[PDB]
Design a protein around this ligand. Sequence first.
Ligand SMILES: CCCCCCCCCCCC[N+](C)(C)[O-]
Ligand SMILES: CCCCCCCCCCCC[N+](C)(C)[O-]
Lengths: 183, 183, 183, 183, 222, 86, 81
Amino acid sequence: DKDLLKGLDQEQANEVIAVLQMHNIEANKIDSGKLGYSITVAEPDFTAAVYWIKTYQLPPRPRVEIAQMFPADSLVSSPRAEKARLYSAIEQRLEQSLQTMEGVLSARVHISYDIDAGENGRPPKPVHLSALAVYERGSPLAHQISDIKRFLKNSFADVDYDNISVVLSERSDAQLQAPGTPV
Amino acid sequence: DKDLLKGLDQEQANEVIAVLQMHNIEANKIDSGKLGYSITVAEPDFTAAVYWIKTYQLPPRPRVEIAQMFPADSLVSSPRAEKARLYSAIEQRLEQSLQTMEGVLSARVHISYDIDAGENGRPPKPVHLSALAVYERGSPLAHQISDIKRFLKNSFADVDYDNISVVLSERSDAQLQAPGTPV
Amino acid sequence: DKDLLKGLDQEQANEVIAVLQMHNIEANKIDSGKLGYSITVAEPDFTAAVYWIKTYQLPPRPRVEIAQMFPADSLVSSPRAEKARLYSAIEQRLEQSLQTMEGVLSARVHISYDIDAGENGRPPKPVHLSALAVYERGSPLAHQISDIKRFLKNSFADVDYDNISVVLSERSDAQLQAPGTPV
Amino acid sequence: DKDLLKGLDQEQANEVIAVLQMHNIEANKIDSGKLGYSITVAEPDFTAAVYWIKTYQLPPRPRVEIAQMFPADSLVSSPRAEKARLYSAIEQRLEQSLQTMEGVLSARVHISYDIDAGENGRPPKPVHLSALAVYERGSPLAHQISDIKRFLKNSFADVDYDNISVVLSERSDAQLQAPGTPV
Amino acid sequence: AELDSLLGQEKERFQVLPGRDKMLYVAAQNERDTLWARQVLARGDYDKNARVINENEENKRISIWLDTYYPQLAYYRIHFDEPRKPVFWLSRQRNTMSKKELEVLSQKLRALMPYADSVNITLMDDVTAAGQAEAGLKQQALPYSRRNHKGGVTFVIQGALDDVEILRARQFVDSYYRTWGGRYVQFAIELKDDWLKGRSFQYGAEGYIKMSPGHWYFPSPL
Amino acid sequence: MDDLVFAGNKALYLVLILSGWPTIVATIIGLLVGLFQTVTQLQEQTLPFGIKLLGVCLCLFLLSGWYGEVLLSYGRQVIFLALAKG
Amino acid sequence: VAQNALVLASPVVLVLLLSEVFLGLLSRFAPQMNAFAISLTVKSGIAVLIMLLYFSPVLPDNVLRLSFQATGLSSWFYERG
Ligand SMILES: CCCCCCCCCCCC[N+](C)(C)[O-]
Ligand SMILES: CCCCCCCCCCCC[N+](C)(C)[O-]
């Protein structure tokens, strides 16, 4: 067996295994504890595994959230940092609420950070929102965009339906059968 | 066997292997732990491997992100540094969102850093955005540019379709068969 | 055997081997660890190797980036030093993105550093950009300049197509066959 | 054998050997480690070697760059020093980019430092540039000056083709045959 | 040890042909495959003589030879869909030749291509070429201008074009060139700070009048 | 503008230069006398004043000239910067 | 108005405090040393030296960031008739 990756985290290893199985590559996950997880494949599949790891840029990076740039640990905060942390927390709470709607599998949301200027001495601009979501197969997407827009409109003091962008997509085909082992 | 490179990390080693295999050069990756990875090739292929290593400027460098220029540890922070960190986080969060769309394999995004001025005493300029993305084979690229533009437009307080540049490309042919061993 | 160079870096040695092989000079790379790499050639080829080392001014130097001139570890940053670091990070991030386009092997980019005056009390001047890039053989360069200009235009607050210079070139012939050994 | 020089650097020794060989003088390079390199020749060639060492003023002096006069390790900086370091790094980065064009071996660039004055209360003067380059044999120099001028023009806020001087030259004949040994 | 056994597990990807000069020719489809083949030979995995070829390289080489011995021949492209029987497209209007001359030309081409059994010469219509070009631009709804010369036609596409237009344009041009080659129609794509996209007018007492084309253009304030 | 910034900076720079030497010698004399009074235990407190008065006056005698040349040159410079505009 | 002045002066006060406590701690080894009278000799030199480094930003740090501007009239006044 040839070593592809070592010292992976659990959430990275399961992502790599998922992507390789989709392309008919049988892979093995090994645990070394404090040294993390290792991924191995057979020689006939080594080349392909390398090319897919490059093409998808695996292993995945950790997820970024704006509150990481402005830790509360400091004794000081300008208005700008506090306002940034506030919006960075609303974004997360809206995503967690949308995941509870009927049929939605995952979603992601973005808000206009008008705080990139202080709005000092100046009138504050209107809010803009964008959302992405994935649905179960056989969902009437057209008739479901309305509900999302209606829900998001009232989460802020001033939002127009014109200023809300929504993009929906369906789940891909299920990978249920196991890949074949090299002869 | 001749030594090409030593002391690689994991993500450099796998990129070098990928690029050599594409040109029919069989290579071997060895792990020395604290000494990193080593890459070796046969003599008949040494010349070619040297020429490609030069042409592609391998091994690759690490990714650059603007937040590396403005550590939060400094005793003083001008507005300029805070605003820079903010934008440099938004860029990364958008990239990570685009990778969730249907068919997109990877992408990159750029924002106009007007933070190169404070806009102290001046009315603030409009935002400009650029995106690059790679798609699965058989995707109607023309019909998919619309989705990207729509999604990006509402992520900022003031953006015009005229100010958004989008460039798309397809995945190259898959490298599935293994290279031949020197006679 | 005669010693040409000693105490080289890895990246600095593989370039010398590449340049000598191109001219039919068989060379050997030896590792002394803490003393670095050494390059050796046969006597019949010594004269030629000396002439080429002079002509190309080998070994190559380290690459320069403006941020090296204004280290972030200073006690204080003038607005000049902050603004310079900022631009010198955007340049690198753009080069790394251009290398991801289809067919581009390598590229370089330059921005007009208007910061050589503070623009304090002055109306700030427009930005100018230049780029160089190398393509795979058989690329219609004329048709590909458009994409690059389009992509760069929106990365900044104010840029005109007239102010962007782009120069493209193709890869040289591949060096695949090994040089002959002196009789 | 008579001693010509002692305590050389590697880069000084190889330049001396190259110039002696060009005039048909067989020379020997010896390594004493911490004491550096020594160069020796036969008596019949001693006189000539002395006359050429005088004529070329060997060994070469180290390369000069303006940043060396204003080390960044100072605890104080005037605006003038900062501005000088800036320009002294742009010059180097441009020379390093020009060496990547098609078939350029080496190049040099110079920029007009207005920094020797503040241009105090005056509209600051426009920038001027000069460049030198060495091409491979069989290059249409006339057609290649245009590209260089075009590339340089957009690297700065205000440059006129009239203010750019470019001087090009071809490489000399190759020194491939070895010198004859004294009888 | 045959050569096909050395090129890989996929077999149909390459095509091996014998030639009258007693040399093997390997036909490839693209640059990447071409290098995948060339590595085998230059490494020396094979002992006899062999060579790698593709359509673009051979088009170039043949054009270089035509430039010397037939410096006034008007022609389009040579197609190698069936590498044993190439097809050479000549202009009907621009060439005057006898049947005998055409036959001689055929034989000399056959002498340049030792892997081909015969060369078929076909006459094509210039109006057809030009028409298919213009229809493809109208079909994509790109803005353009046409200019005619005794030996060619130019289409110029310029202005502040949109991303979608750029994409569709570049796809079309890439497709057409593969069929007809560059020798007769040129497409030029140039971005400008011009929202009219190359149109121009003058305002007189009679209102607007369309300007002739030219180099200079009015950069839009709008 | 830059003339204003330059002149204001120079003012502080000249203060620093002129005042620096007297304050140095008054420091060194303060440290030496304070140490001496621990090396031999004596609890006087006017002795520093008595010595440092002579110390400061002596260097005012020494530097009396350079003080006037520096200030004249500065005054002429700033009068030029103020009035010579065209 | 008070806050902006303290925020701006803070860098010089801290260094002048640390300079005095450093002499206080030094005095523990030589109790006849008049650390107060020494500090009076030092502090005016230190104060000018330090203010001379952070001097140039004093241009922009006032010309814009503190100047009143006409858009502010909306909030400081209203019409009561
Ligand atoms: C307690 C003395 C304070 C003196 C402050 C002024 C110092 C400059 C005196 C003038 C120049 C020197 N001198 C000897 C001519 O007096
Ligand atoms: C308090 C600053 C130092 C004391 C000197 C003040 C300037 C006095 C006038 C200087 C005249 C010089 N002189 C005699 C050559 O004309």
